[PDB]
């Protein structure tokens, strides 16, 4: 059933060159391509949350898209909720992973005050996430979405489509994000057609990075295999502006 789990101040880290994804499905190679899209700004302040420290796992704004990343070994983070009022009055998007699969549903979910998944539990998705749900319009099932392992996701909501990008890499850091460039790949395009203004992270009963996308111009460097190996944020500094103008890293 629904139970109460619960406010602490935010910490901040730096997304040095993280949050870049392939802007489209067009193959390019051995070329510097200039594109305009919603990307995480370079060297920005990313909010670092500790959901378990006292439980504090707040609802955050979606804005124009969300940059989400986390590092762990136990796989405590299970999924996300995206919607508006996040109750039975509106359609909401529930994305939750388990050991063998991922289930994505859009329904009029009446979510719990402090929603979570139960390791030892109705159904697996219904344990502590919501009390009821009806009028389902979308259902999708596929393969799981989720030293230490760093998992990076970008969530966009454009013209009714909820677009998810992701990357999975090894990490050997404790306090902050890694340096270097790595682009996120398209994961799934979901033809849902709902309003998303806010979101929340679902845990199994924990820390994560949250940033936001901006209308930014980037110069992307594609190697001989069509992989992006670098990028320039054309609105970061005079040096980057010069590099973008001259099309040269």
């Amino acid at each position, epitope marked *: 059933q629904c139970v109460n789990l619960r406010q602490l101040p935010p910490a901040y880290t730096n997304s040095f060159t993280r949050g870049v994804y392939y802007p489209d499905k067009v193959f390019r190679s051995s070329v510097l391509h200039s594109t305009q899209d919603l990307f995480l700004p370079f060297f920005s302040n990313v909010t670092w949350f500790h959901a378990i420290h006292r439980f504090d796992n707040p609802v*955050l704004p979606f804005n124009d898209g969300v940059y989400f990343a986390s590092t762990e070994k136990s796989n405590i983070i299970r999924g996300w909720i995206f919607g508006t009022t996040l109750d039975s009055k509106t359609q909401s998007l529930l994305i939750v992973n388990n050991a063998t699969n991922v289930v994505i549903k859009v329904c009029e979910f009446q979510f719990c005050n402090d929603p979570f998944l139960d390791v030892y539990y109705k159904s697996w998705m219904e344990s502590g996430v919501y009390s009821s749900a009806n009028n389902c319009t979308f259902e999708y099932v596929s393969q799981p979405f989720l030293f230490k392992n760093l998992r990076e996701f970008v969530f966009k909501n454009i013209d009714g489509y909820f677009k998810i990008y992701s990357k999975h890499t090894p990490i050997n850091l404790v306090r902050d994000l890694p340096q270097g460039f790595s682009a996120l790949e398209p994961l799934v395009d979901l033809p849902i057609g709902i309003n998303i203004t806010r979101f929340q992270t679902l845990l199994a009963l924990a820390a994560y990075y949250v940033g936001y996308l901006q209308p930014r111009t980037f110069l992307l460097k594609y190697n001989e295999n069509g992989t992006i190996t670098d990028a320039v944020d054309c609105a970061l500094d005079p040096l980057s502006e010069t590099k973008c103008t001259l099309k040269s890293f």
Partner: antibody
Amino acid sequence: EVQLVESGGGVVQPGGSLRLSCAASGFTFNSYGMHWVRQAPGKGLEWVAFIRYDGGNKYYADSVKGRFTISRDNSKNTLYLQMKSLRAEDTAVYYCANLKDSRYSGSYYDYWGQGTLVTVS
Amino acid sequence: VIWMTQSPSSLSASVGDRVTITCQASQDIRFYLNWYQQKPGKAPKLLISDASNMETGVPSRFSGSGSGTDFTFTISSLQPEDIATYYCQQYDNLPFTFGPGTKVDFK
């Protein structure tokens, strides 16, 4: 933990101008949009202006539209309101706030400042 | 612009009495109405959002409901600490607007 503090209030003559600011702390200011609300003595609440988290889109009440400008600086966590061509009718206590909003700004928590008095005479 | 009104503009009630406040919109705003409570010298506090959703920390004696143009705010049993001015506010569209405000006096 969360606070909003207004400053820059004072007394000006009609036709003059006054600039307000609000210092935000205890929360991720740069992820939320912000509102200005004013309340005259003996009167109810009146909404003034809204700015989105990225400092882009700006909205104003018709009663102040064309005279007031809303802006912000996310590197200093400070919200600003620039008041030009002030009238006697603009006398009010001005507040900065993060109003709970499930449609536009995506604000889950409702925050208010202390209020600063702006007098035009 | 959506115009808002409230009735009565003022009411008197004693402790234990049930207090109801009516907020009406000139336009249909579905379920996007906020209710605030203000005492002299302080900024307004949010009690109810989304027409009927209670905020964290708000006493169970407070409630409300409604949809479209006609909404009601209710205090099931007035306490001595509930003497305040209540406001309704719509956030269905921009600009945001507040109603006149209903003052609750102690009888």
